[PDB]
C-alpha cells in the first residue's frame, strides 16, 4: 500500500545520473511549458523593468523515471528535485529574481507512470523593458519575457508552449493601476550564438497606458494656469503692478509644474509628448507677459513720437491660438 | 543514549519524500495562526506586512513511539528529516522565514504520531485596494494559504478550532500608522488551477484608514486657501495690484497642493475622493480671480475714496453679492462632501 | 607528486584546533592593500572601503619536505585548513567577493608558513565629529581582531609595509581628500578576554569646493539682493516690501537644503552660523525699512538709507573677516 | 451606471446554468457572488469567487453548485447541479469588495435584479 | 601538546546527538545572556524601527562536553557550532537581522573543563519599536528587544541575565545624533502562548530626543517669519500692494515649511505637537492678513457712511506680540 | 549507462585543487565576452551595469576520453568537480551570478581535453568619471579581469579570436538612457602585486553623454529666465513695483534652477561646465536689477507719462541695456556652445 511506493521510488534513483540529459546520445528532449501568472507588481519607467509573479511549469518525458504497478501520479516532496534532471531555463531580461522560499522552496515534482514529470516553480522575476516613452503618457509599450535554455542547444533540448495560445493563463485577471494589457503573444524561435543554436520561447505583453492620472495632475492645471495668464488683457494698461504680477506668477507656476514632473521621470534624452505640452503651454504663458512689455513700450516709450486695440485683439486671438494648439496636440498623439 | 535510539528507530524505515498514506487516504493538516504584529500597510505597493506564528498540526502514522516522555520537544534539524507540508502563500510577494539565531521552527511529536510544527514568518502579502473613496475608504486584505503540490485528494487543510477563534491577533502588537484593524474574517476556499484543486485557507483583515493625517496636510490647507481667496472680496475695488497679487497666488497655492497630495498615493486612472475635493476647491479659487476681472472691467475710475470726502466709485453690486454667495456655497459644499463619504 | 603532498598534510589534520593550542599564541602578520575608499556617507556616518586583506602564520601541521617548495592553491583548501576568525570590529556591512569563483588565495611553503589573502569591501563605521562643517577633518578607523581567540591564543602584528595605499585618483572621495595614514596596536578588555586589536586610521580632510557653489554662493548673493533695496526710492512701498519679504522666503529655502546634506545633529556647525547670520541680515533689511517708512511717512532717520548703504556691506564683510579666518586658519 | 444584468433558466425539472453579465465597471479586482432568497425574506449565500480564482461555497451547497467566472467577458456563472425542490427561490447576482464579507449580504454594493428559478416535483 | 587535545575533542563529538538539549528528560537548562553593544546605527521614525549591532553571548553547561586533563579553556573553530546543541533564541521585535560573515561567520565556541560552553554571536538586528509621536520633537520614546526561546518552554530552558545589573554593557558608549539614552532596564519574565509558557528577557532603552536640530530648522524660522508678518502694522493703510504682499508672502512661507515637514515624517493620524506650533503660528500669520482686510473694509466700505483706522493698527502692535508671547509661554511650558 | 561510466573515469584520480600542467607548462585560458545589455550607467555611484556571457576556454590534459560523442554537453554539477580558473573582475563592486532556474553555467568537454565553460553574469563594475566637462563629456569605462591566485608564470589569459572582435555587444540590447556606446577598445596588461605579477585583460567601453535632457530641463529654463529678466528693459522707468517683480523673481528662479541642476550629479567639489553656465546666467540676471537700482537712483519723478507740467524721459541707460544685454548674452552663447561642443 505504502511501503511498496517507497520501494519503487528508492530504485528509480538507484543508479540515476543527474548530469546526463535524457537520451543523452539520442533525440533531443521536448520540454513543454505552461505559465500561470499571479500578478504584475510594478511597471517602472525609471528603472526600465517590470516585476512578474508566475507559476512556471515544465513537462518533459524521462524514461529513467518510468514506474509500473502504481496507478496514481507520484506527488513527491520538493527536495527530490535536487536529485533529478531539470532544464536550465533562464531569462535574458532577468535583473533580479528568486524562487519563493516560504514556507518551503515552492517546487513540485509530480511523476507520471509513463515517465512524464511536472516541475512547477513560483517565480517572482524582475524582467527588463527598454520603453519607448516618446509619446509619454499617451503611448503603448511592449514588455517581453525571454525564456531560453542555457547549456543545451536545439540538438539537445526543444521548447514548445503547451496548449498552443492557451499556454499562458491569468492575463485577463491582471488589473494594473496605470496600464491596460491589450494583447499578449506567444513566440517560439531558435536563437543562434557562437556556442550554438538554442531554443527560445517568448511571452510578450502590450501595455496601453491609462491617462487619467495625468489629466488630474499634469494637463488640467497646465490648461488653467495658461487661462489665468489671460486675465491681464481685461485689465487696463495703467495697472503696471497688476498685469506684471499675474504674468510673473504664471511663468513661476509653469516652472514649478516642470520641476515637480522632472523628479518623477527618468533621464530620457529626447522630448516626450508631455514635455512638448508643458513647453508648449509655457510659450502661451510667456507670450502673455511679452505682450504687456509690447503694450508698455508703445504707450510709455513711443508715446510722444493704438494701446486698446492690441489688448482687444489678443482677447480673442490667444484663446483661439491655444485652443488650436490643443486641437493639433490631442489629435496627433492620440 | 535512551532517547537517541528512540529517534533513530523512527528514522530507520522513514521516507520524507512521500506523504503519510500516499496510496491510502488524504492528509488532514490542522492550521492555527497567531498574528503578533499586523505590520505597516504600504499604499503605493498595495501590500501589507504581517508577522505570525504559523502553526500546523497533522498525524503521521510512521512516527509512533513508546518511551518515557509522552511528547518529544525536539530540535529544528529533525524537522528537515520529516515530511513537512508545502504550504505557500497565494498572495505573498516577498516573505521571510526567520532564522535568528537558529531556524525558528519547533517540532513536537506526541506518542501517537500527531505532529505539531510551528514557525515564525514575516509575510508581505498583496491587498487589492479600491481607492475611489480615498482617504475615507475601508478595504479587506486577504491572507490566503494552501498546499503547493498536493491537491484535495491528497492534503486537506482545516482549522484547529472554530475558524472565528483559529486566527488570534495579539493585543499589544498593532504596528499600524494609518489604518485600524476592525477585525478578521476566516473562511476557506477551493481553486481550479492547471494542476488540480487545492484547499485554500483564507483570513481577511478588515482595515479602515484613519483620515487624521490627510485632513492636516491636505484638507486644512485647501480649505483655508479658499478662505484666503474670499478675503479679497472685502478689499476695495480700486486696489487693482493688491487683489491681483492676492488672487493669482492662491491659485499657485492650490496648484502646489494639487500635485503634492496626488504624490502620496498610487497612480490609478480614476479620481479619488480627495481629488474631487481639491478640484472643487481649486474652482472656488479660480472663480475668485475671475470675479475680480469682472470688478476690474466695470471700475470706470482709478482713484479711491479719500477720507475727507469729485465723484467716486460705489462698492460694486457683484462684490457685495460674492461676499454673501461664495462663502455660503463653500459651506454648503462641505455639507455635501463630508456627509456623502463619511456615511459610507 | 603534489596530490601526494596535499593528502598527507590533511591526513590527521584537525581544522578546529588552533596551531600551538597549548604552547604559545599564534603570531599572525597582517597586510592590507587599500584599493579604494568609497563614498564617505556623512548621514549614516559610514564609509565604504575596498581592501585586499592578507595574513601569514606558521603552522607546523602543514610542513613537508619536497622539491615543490611552495603550494600555490585556490580557495578550495581554505575550508580544510585552520583560518583565523578575523572580524572587522567597526564594520556595519562587510562582504567578500564570490564572483566568479571565491576570491580567496592560499599558499603553503615547506616550513609551514601559510599565506592567506582575500578580497573584501567594508561599509565601516566612523563617528563624524561635524563641528566646523564643512571645514573639518576626520580620522575614520578600520579595526580588526580575532573573535574567539584572546591575547593568550592569537597575537596580531604588522609587517614592514603595513598598509599600502593605491593610486588615490580612482577613489570615490568627493568631499574628502586622503591626507594621511596611521596604524596602532592596542588590547581591548571585553568580557570574554583581552583581544589584540589592530587599527588603521585614515586621515580625511575636506575638498571644500562643493558647498561653496551650493550654499555659500547662493547665500551671499541673496544677502546682496537685499542691499539693492537701499538704492531704490523711499516712497516705493510695494517694491521695497517685495524686496524684503521675498528675500526672506528664499533664505528659508536655502536654510533647509544646507541641513539636508549633513545628518540631523543638534549642535550648531560652521555652516549653520553662516546661514543664520545671513538670515539675520535679510531679517534686518526689512525691519530697517519698517522703521524708515513709519518714522518718515506715518510720523537721523531721513539719512538712514544713506547710512545703511555703507554699514550693511561693512557689517557683512567684517563678519566674513571673523568667519573665514577663525574657522579655516585658527 | 452599473447594471448586473442576469440571465439563465427559470423553469427546470436536470442541470441549469444561471449567468450574470456585467456592464459599466470591470469587476476583475472585485468579488462577484451568487445569492438565494426564498419566499420568506432570507438572503442566503450560495457561492463567490475571489480575484485569485478561489471558490467560496455555502454550507448547504458545497458540492452541488459550481461557480465559474469569465474575467474577459466580465461575467459570473453559477452551474446548478442536482436541483432539489427546496431550491425554488430567486437567485441574485452580487458584485462587491467584501468588507466584513464573503458571507454577509451587506458587503456587496452592486446587485442583479433576480431570477425566479422554479424546480417542480 | 596537540595529539592529546585532538583525542579529547574528537571524543566529545563522538556519539554526540545535537537533537537533544542537556538533561533532555530531566531538569531545565539555564542559559545566561550577556550583551556587548557595538552601536545603535539608525532609529528611523518613518519605518518605526531601530538598528542594533551587538555582541551576543550565551553561557550554559553541557555534561556531554566535559573533558579532563587539560587546564585550558578550549576555544574551537566556529564550524563546531554546527555540531553542538545551541539554544533557538529569537527576537520578537526582529524585522531583519543577519550574523556578520567576514572573514568567517562570527561565532565562537569556548568549551570549559566542567561542561560550560560559551557561544558568542555578533548580530546586527533591526528591531521594531512603535512610537507615540504626540509630543514630537520634544518627546521620549523607549524601544525594546525581546530575547526569547522558540522551541523550548520554561520546563525545558531558563533564561537569566549574567549580572542582572551589569549584563548589558556598552550602553553609555552609544552616540546617537538625534537621541540621548537616559537609562536601560533588564526585565526577566515569562510569556504564555497557546503552545506553552516560554521564558523571555527584554532589553529596553528609554531614548530622549535632542531638540537642537529642530530649533535651528523648524522653530526659529517659524518665529522670525511670524515676526516679519508684523511689519505691515508700521506701514500706512493706503499701501494696499505692500501690506497685502507682505501677508500673502507670509502665508506662502508657512505653507512651504509644512511641505518639508510632511516629507521627512511618517503618516500618522494626529497632531504631532510640532503641528500644534506650525498650525498655531499659521493663525498669527493668517490673523495678520485678516487685520488689513478689517482695516480696508472700515476705511473704504464703512468709511463714507461714517471706527478709527489708526487705532486698530496701534491696538495690533501691542496685542499680537503679547498674544504670541503668551502662545510660546503655554507651548514651551506644556511640552517641556 | 555508457556515458555514466565515461564521466566516472574522468573523475577517478582527478584533483580539482591543482592546475592543469602544474609543473610542466603554463595554463592558457582563452576568454570571450558577449555583452547582452550594456546597462544603466550610474552617475552618482560612478559605476555601470553590464550583463554578459563570460566565456573562458582552456585545455585540461586529465579530462581526455574516447566515446560515442566527440563533444558531450553537461549539466553544471560537474563544473564544481573540475578545476576552473579563478577569474575575478578587478573593478567589479557587487556582481551577480544568476541562479534562475538553475546555475546559468555550461561545461562542454571535447575529446582532446579542451574545456568550454561559460556563465551569465551581471557585472556592476567601477567607472572613474572626470566630470569637468559635464554634460558634454566622454568617458572610457573599464572591465578589467584576471586571475586571483595564479600569477603570470602559472596562468595566461588570452582572447579566443582577434582581440577587438572578441568583446562583442548585442545589436538590440543597448539599455542606456544618457550615453552613446561608441564602441570599445580592448588591451592586455600585467598588474604587478606584492604577491606576484598577474595577467589582466582590459576592455574600455567608450561612452559619450547625450545632451538633450539637460537642454530641455536646465539650459532652456535658464536661458528663458535671462530673457525674462531682460523683458523689464522695455517697460517705463516709473513702474517701480513692476520692474522690481521682474528683478526679484528671476533671481529666485536662477537660485532654484541652480539647486535643481546639481541634483542630477554626484557631489564632486569642483565646477562643472553646467555650473559655469548658470553662474554666468545668474550674472546677467543679477545685473538687470542693479540696472534698475541705477535707474531708480536717477528717476526724480513719481508720476508716469500721461496720454494727453514736465514729465520724465526714457532713461538713456535703458536704451543701452536693451542693446548690450541681449548682445552680450548672445555673444556668450556663441563662446559657450562652441568651446564645449568640441571636447
Ligand atoms: C512586441 O515585440 C516582440 C519582439 O519584437 C514581437 O514579437 C514578434 O512577434 C512576431 C509575430 O508573432 C514574430 O514573428 C513570427 O515568428 C514566428 C517564429 O518563427 C520562427 O519559427 C518558425 C517555425 O515555427 C520558422 O519558420 C521561422 O523562420 C522563419 O522566420 C525567420 C524570421 O527571422 C526567418 O529568418 C527565416 O528565414 C524563416 O522565414 C522562425 O525560426 C513565425 O512562425 C511567424 O510566422 C508566422 O506568422 C506570420 C504572420 O505574423 C505568417 O505570415 C507566417 O506564414 C507564419 O504563420 C512570425 O514570423 C516575431 O518572431 C517576434 N519577434 C521576436 C524577436 O521574437 C511582438 O509581436 C510585439 N508585440 C507584442 C504585443 O508582443
Ligand atoms: C519600556 O516600556 C516597557 C513597557 O511599558 C517597560 O517594560 C516593562 O518594565 C517593567 C519594569 O519597569 C516590567 O515589570 C517588572 O516585571 C518583573 C517580572 O518578574 C517576573 O518574575 C517574577 C518572579 O521572579 C514574577 O512574580 C512576575 O510576575 C509578576 O509580573 C507579571 C508581569 O511581568 C504579572 O503578570 C504577574 O501577575 C506578577 O505580578 C514576573 O513573571 C517583576 O518582577 C517586576 O516587579 C517588581 O518591580 C515592581 C516595580 O517595577 C514592584 O512593584 C514589584 O513588587 C516587584 O518588585 C516588574 O513588574 C514589565 O514586565 C515590562 N513589561 C513588558 C511588556 O516588557 C520597560 O521597562 C520600559 N523601559 C524603560 C527603560 O523605561
Ligand atoms: C462671478 C460674478 C460674475 C458677475 C458677472 C456680472 C456681469 C455684468 O453684466 O456685470 C455688470 C454689473 C456690474 O456692476 P458693478 O456694480 O460692478 O459696476 C457699477 C455699474 O457699472 C453701475 O452701472 C455704475 O454706475 P452708473 O452707470 O453711473 O449708474 C457704477 O459706477 P460708479 O459707482 O463707479 O460711478 C459701477 O461701479 O453687474 C450688475 O449690475 C449685477 C450683475 C450680477 C451678476 C451675478 C452673477 C452670478
Ligand atoms: C549696470 C549699469 C550701470 C550704469 C551706471 C551709470 C552711472 C551714471 O553716471 O549714470 C548717469 C547717466 C544716467 O542717465 P539717465 O538717462 O538714467 O538719467 C537722466 C540724467 O540724469 C539727465 O541728466 C537728467 O536730466 P537733466 O539734464 O539733469 O535735467 C534726466 O532727468 P529727467 O529726464 O528725469 O528730467 C535723467 O533721467 O548715464 C549716462 O548718461 C550714460 C551712462 C551709460 C552707462 C551704461 C551702462 C551699461
Tab-separated table of C-alpha atoms and ligand atoms in Angstrom, chain A residues 141-144 146 183-190 202 204-206, ligand 1:
chain	number	residue	atom	x	y	z
A	141	UNK	CA	4.501	49.619	-24.560
A	142	UNK	CA	5.770	46.116	-25.334
A	143	UNK	CA	7.247	44.109	-22.447
A	144	UNK	CA	8.722	40.676	-23.150
A	146	UNK	CA	12.520	35.689	-22.886
A	183	UNK	CA	-2.840	41.681	-26.169
A	184	UNK	CA	-0.272	39.010	-25.346
A	185	UNK	CA	1.605	36.808	-27.817
A	186	UNK	CA	3.493	33.505	-27.659
A	187	UNK	CA	6.580	33.253	-29.883
A	188	UNK	CA	8.797	30.189	-30.380
A	189	UNK	CA	12.075	30.592	-32.258
A	190	UNK	CA	15.687	29.433	-32.306
A	202	UNK	CA	8.876	34.494	-25.688
A	204	UNK	CA	5.256	39.360	-24.594
A	205	UNK	CA	2.621	41.854	-23.431
A	206	UNK	CA	1.188	45.041	-24.911
G	1	LIG	C1	6.494	43.010	-29.117
G	1	LIG	O1	7.821	42.757	-29.578
G	1	LIG	C2	8.065	41.377	-29.887
G	1	LIG	C3	9.527	41.264	-30.253
G	1	LIG	O2	9.845	42.072	-31.379
G	1	LIG	C4	7.133	40.928	-31.009
G	1	LIG	O3	7.340	39.543	-31.267
G	1	LIG	C5	7.452	39.203	-32.605
G	1	LIG	O4	6.181	38.683	-32.996
G	1	LIG	C6	6.105	38.278	-34.370
G	1	LIG	C7	4.653	37.950	-34.638
G	1	LIG	O5	4.194	36.895	-33.804
G	1	LIG	C8	7.070	37.114	-34.587
G	1	LIG	O6	7.066	36.701	-35.952
G	1	LIG	C9	6.749	35.361	-36.071
G	1	LIG	O7	7.810	34.445	-35.785
G	1	LIG	C10	7.386	33.071	-35.778
G	1	LIG	C11	8.573	32.243	-35.349
G	1	LIG	O8	9.389	31.930	-36.466
G	1	LIG	C12	10.380	31.033	-36.122
G	1	LIG	O9	9.933	29.671	-36.137
G	1	LIG	C13	9.388	29.246	-37.402
G	1	LIG	C14	8.918	27.821	-37.221
G	1	LIG	O10	7.907	27.727	-36.226
G	1	LIG	C15	10.438	29.395	-38.501
G	1	LIG	O11	9.856	29.066	-39.756
G	1	LIG	C16	10.949	30.831	-38.516
G	1	LIG	O12	11.934	31.033	-39.526
G	1	LIG	C17	11.420	31.977	-40.394
G	1	LIG	O13	11.394	33.308	-39.859
G	1	LIG	C18	12.693	33.892	-39.650
G	1	LIG	C19	12.461	35.246	-39.022
G	1	LIG	O14	13.682	35.936	-38.800
G	1	LIG	C20	13.441	33.968	-40.978
G	1	LIG	O15	14.743	34.494	-40.757
G	1	LIG	C21	13.533	32.577	-41.590
G	1	LIG	O16	14.176	32.645	-42.858
G	1	LIG	C22	12.149	31.958	-41.740
G	1	LIG	O17	11.391	32.689	-42.698
G	1	LIG	C23	11.492	31.219	-37.148
G	1	LIG	O18	12.594	30.388	-36.809
G	1	LIG	C24	6.869	32.688	-37.163
G	1	LIG	O19	6.373	31.355	-37.126
G	1	LIG	C25	5.763	33.645	-37.595
G	1	LIG	O20	5.356	33.373	-38.931
G	1	LIG	C26	4.003	33.100	-38.916
G	1	LIG	O21	3.192	34.276	-38.803
G	1	LIG	C27	3.292	35.158	-39.934
G	1	LIG	C28	2.487	36.391	-39.598
G	1	LIG	O22	2.989	37.038	-38.436
G	1	LIG	C29	2.797	34.436	-41.184
G	1	LIG	O23	2.930	35.294	-42.311
G	1	LIG	C30	3.609	33.165	-41.393
G	1	LIG	O24	3.093	32.439	-42.503
G	1	LIG	C31	3.589	32.286	-40.145
G	1	LIG	O25	2.286	31.751	-39.948
G	1	LIG	C32	6.216	35.094	-37.476
G	1	LIG	O26	7.235	35.363	-38.431
G	1	LIG	C33	8.477	37.560	-34.210
G	1	LIG	O27	9.377	36.462	-34.300
G	1	LIG	C34	8.528	38.133	-32.793
G	1	LIG	N1	9.844	38.690	-32.524
G	1	LIG	C35	10.759	38.085	-31.761
G	1	LIG	C36	12.071	38.797	-31.623
G	1	LIG	O28	10.540	37.010	-31.211
G	1	LIG	C37	5.684	41.172	-30.613
G	1	LIG	O29	4.822	40.866	-31.704
G	1	LIG	C38	5.492	42.631	-30.205
G	1	LIG	N2	4.128	42.863	-29.758
G	1	LIG	C39	3.578	42.213	-28.726
G	1	LIG	C40	2.159	42.577	-28.404
G	1	LIG	O30	4.196	41.370	-28.083
